[PDB]
């Protein structure tokens, strides 16, 4: 059994402007097997209505998924993606950084 750990990017659909509606994205890719758990977090807490793309895979058979939710960024609110996979001893948290 080969196992490949997911790459993770957290980012917005549009350039973040405080007060303006946007989309928060968590893109997990390059992983196998396909079971994975992805939460989008607002100030440490799980956002309730997150949609995700249908499971698909790349040329090397590794899987990728897009989790996304509508949000309105502000200066104080912190956002993050939380990922768990069989390859990870503990859930990995990646913070949202509007410059990445």
């Amino acid at each position: 059994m080969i196992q490949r750990t997911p790459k993770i990017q957290v980012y917005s659909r549009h350039p973040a402007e405080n007060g303006k509606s946007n989309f928060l994205n968590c893109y997990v890719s390059g992983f196998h097997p396909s079971d994975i758990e992805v939460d989008l977090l607002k100030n440490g807490e799980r956002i309730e209505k997150v949609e995700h793309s249908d499971l698909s895979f790349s040329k090397d058979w590794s899987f990728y998924l897009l989790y996304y939710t509508e949000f309105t960024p502000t200066e104080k609110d912190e956002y993050a993606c939380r990922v768990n996979h069989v390859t990870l001893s503990q859930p990995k948290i990646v913070k949202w950084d509007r410059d990445m």
């Binding site: 990017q9 994205n25 196998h32 079971d35 249908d54 895979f57 058979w61 410059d99």
Partner: protein, 276 residues
């Protein structure tokens, strides 16, 4: 330009939790246009792009039957592969299948594809000649001889040269407003101080379609390949894609560095600098 159509299929067994989950999606270029999920309430193949919605109900009936039939054959193949590999019935395993065709600007077949993977490893693949197979191991050689005896490649070849190319050309005509429009990237350079002696230059490319793109940093006109951080091209969620390339530069050296952007939607390859 050149175009592609692809159908992707995944089956994942889950012993003690029902029958294997089956998910298949169809793409033209980097545009998703159909999906089927075995765990949906009333599973049917569903449109995911506007230009496929015009297909009539018997298109959707036949497509749904094919997805359901494929879901069943994957379940049998997963049990088969447990035997071929002397594996326990207690673990979860994965079967993946991809097939499709590439066509050139004049709409003729450039090449076809049909390949399978078991647990994320190559298993058997139709060769580019569309008549012979490459099996990855002795288990896959069993399948290869079954498939040679049934003449599967002859039927795949007929499909890949016939309907695959013909229906791709149809989809390209019906969705030409989007499938035949390249969206160029919006590009800029950002500056992020690290310390007194170093800063990051980040070159951005936003809102582009299709996903193929090249971003390079040069210093004194020489590629900074080994020292450039390059994130994977990622989906924006609105059909377009994003990418950035970054490089750490000594402070005061910023103008030795140039970012180079090539995208099929750009007349000329762009060159960008940072300016405060």
């Amino acid at each position: 330009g050149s175009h592609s159509m692809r159908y992707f299929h995944t089956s994942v067994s889950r012993p003690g939790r029902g029958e294997p989950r089956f998910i298949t999606v169809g793409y033209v270029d980097d545009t998703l246009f159909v999906r089927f999920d075995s765990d949906a309430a009333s599973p049917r193949e569903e449109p995911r792009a506007p230009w496929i919605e015009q297909e009539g109900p018997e298109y959707w009936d036949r497509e749904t039957q094919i997805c359901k039939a494929k879901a069943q054959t994957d379940r049998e193949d997963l049990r088969t592969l447990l035997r071929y590999y002397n594996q326990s019935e207690a673990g979860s395993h994965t079967l993946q299948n991809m097939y499709g065709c590439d066509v050139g600007p004049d709409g003729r077949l450039l090449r076809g594809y049909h390949q399978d993977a078991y647990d994320g490893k190559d298993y058997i693949a139709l060769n580019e000649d569309l008549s012979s197979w490459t099996a990855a191991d002795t288990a896959a050689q069993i399948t290869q001889r079954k498939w040679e005896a049934a003449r599967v490649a002859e039927q795949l070849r007929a499909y890949l040269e016939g309907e695959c190319v013909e229906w791709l050309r149809r989809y390209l005509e019906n969705g030409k407003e989007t499938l035949q429009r390249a969206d160029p990237p919006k590009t800029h350079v950002t500056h992020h101080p690290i310390s007194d002696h170093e800063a990051t230059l980040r070159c951005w490319a936003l809102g582009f379609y299709p996903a193929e793109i090249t971003l390079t940093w040069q210093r004194d006109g020489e590629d900074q390949t080994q020292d450039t951080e390059l994130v994977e091209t990622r989906p924006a969620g609105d059909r377009t894609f994003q990418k950035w390339a970054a490089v750490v530069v000594p402070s005061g050296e910023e103008q030795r560095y140039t970012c180079h952007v090539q995208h099929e939607g750009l007349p000329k390859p762009l060159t960008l600098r940072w300016e405060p």
